[PDB]
Amino acid sequence: TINTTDISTLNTFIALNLSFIQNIDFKAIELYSSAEKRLASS
Amino acid sequence: TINTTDISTLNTFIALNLSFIQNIDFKAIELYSSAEKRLASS
Amino acid sequence: KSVDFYQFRVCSASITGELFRFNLEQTCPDTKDKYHQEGILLVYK
Amino acid sequence: SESKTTAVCPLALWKTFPRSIQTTHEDSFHFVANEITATFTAPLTPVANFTDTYSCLTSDINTTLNASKAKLASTHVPNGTVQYFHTTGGLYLVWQPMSAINLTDNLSYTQLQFAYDKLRDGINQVLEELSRAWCREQVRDNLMWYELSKINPTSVMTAI
Amino acid sequence: TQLQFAYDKLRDGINQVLEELSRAWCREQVRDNLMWYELSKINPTSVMTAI
């Protein structure tokens, strides 16, 4: 009499190794600095 | 003796015909051209 | 006539039926790679 | 008095990017700047045929490129010559391809393009992974059907 | 407007691929039902205990 854990167990899983979607934070950007905007007031 | 290719072979598949998001280019657009901006005048 | 299983029929003749074999060699090829060319990039407004 | 040339040059540098994965497309390119989450497009032809006429920048672009590649030389080398492109929005792109060394206000649409490309890449990759896994299960199912057909092939033929 | 356009294109593509996948999986599901029916012809008790 022995434990069932000692007996090797085989498994048949075709591993559906997925890959989820990471989350990015969209940094707000701009082209022309406010200093240049003032310099363009002329 | 004959070649193995002579014997017909069945195809018991389930075809996973898919489609891939395609790729598109976003043309930059605008509403009022520069001329009307000049038309602003006063 | 083999339209459907609904109609009663008897089909046991076997004289010159077409021959077929099972193929056990097809497999899924592994995915390719991507060059992913890159370098230094500068912008100009 | 002073000539228009050598006095004012209508282009000024905005940002630099050491890492940018140029990816081709059907009829255009795609340059990615993950630092500000943007992507730029350009026609496949290097339309900047005569960037030499913009003779001002010739000086400093050499200097900036030298500084950047001096910083980056610990892991990368130049795998070709540099070129220039003119995007649709109006900006100008200077590209110096590099290979890693072997140890042995109208800018929103750019962000939109970046997000769309990211989603497209992710979706296509997961689709490919799922397709490969299903194909492997399909070969397994074909093996199972072949094993089961050893008893009575007529039933298998009528089912298929 | 451009945002709406991109979102609509993505939603359409995703829904279409989901529909195609569902149809293919249903076809394979009918095939698996037929296979289970064929396998149950020997020892139906095992099939019933598994289901």
User: Cβ D37–A24 below 8 Å, yes or no?
Assistant: yes
Closest B-chain CA to D111: B26
Name chain B contacts of C17, Cβ cutoff 8 Å: none
Of D124, D123, D122, D117, which is closest to residue D39 (Cα–Cα)? D117
Q: Which resolution in angstroms does this entry have?
A: 3.6
Please calculate the CA angle A19-A21-A23 and round it to the nearest 5 degrees. Answer: 145
| Token pair 């397994």: residue | D140
Neighbour tally for C42: CB within 10 Å: 22
Chains A and B in direct contact, meaning 3 or more beta-carbon pairs closer than 8 angstroms: no
Distance, CA of C8 to CA of C2 (rounded, Å): 10
Which one of D107, D112, D154 makes the best mutation probe of the E interface by having the most chain E beta carbons within 10 Å? D112
Chain D, window 72-131: residues with a beta carbon less than 8 angstroms from a chain C beta carbon: 72, 78-79, 90-98, 128
What 3-state class would DSSP assign to C34?
coil
A&D contacts, CB < 8 Å: 38
Please calculate the CA angle C22-B18-C23 and round it to the nearest 5 degrees. Answer: 10
Q: What is the DSSP letter of D74?
A: T
Technique used? cryo-EM
Alpha carbon separation from D156 to B36, D13, D152 (Å, rounded): 75, 71, 7
User: Cβ A26–D37 below 8 Å, yes or no?
Assistant: yes
Distance, CA of D98 to CA of D74 (rounded, Å): 12
Q: How far apart are the first and last CA of chain A?
A: 96
Q: Does A2 touch chain D (CB under 8 A)?
A: no
| Token pair 């459907």: residue | C4
Cβ–Cβ < 8 Å for D69, D80: no
Closest D-chain CA to C29: D132
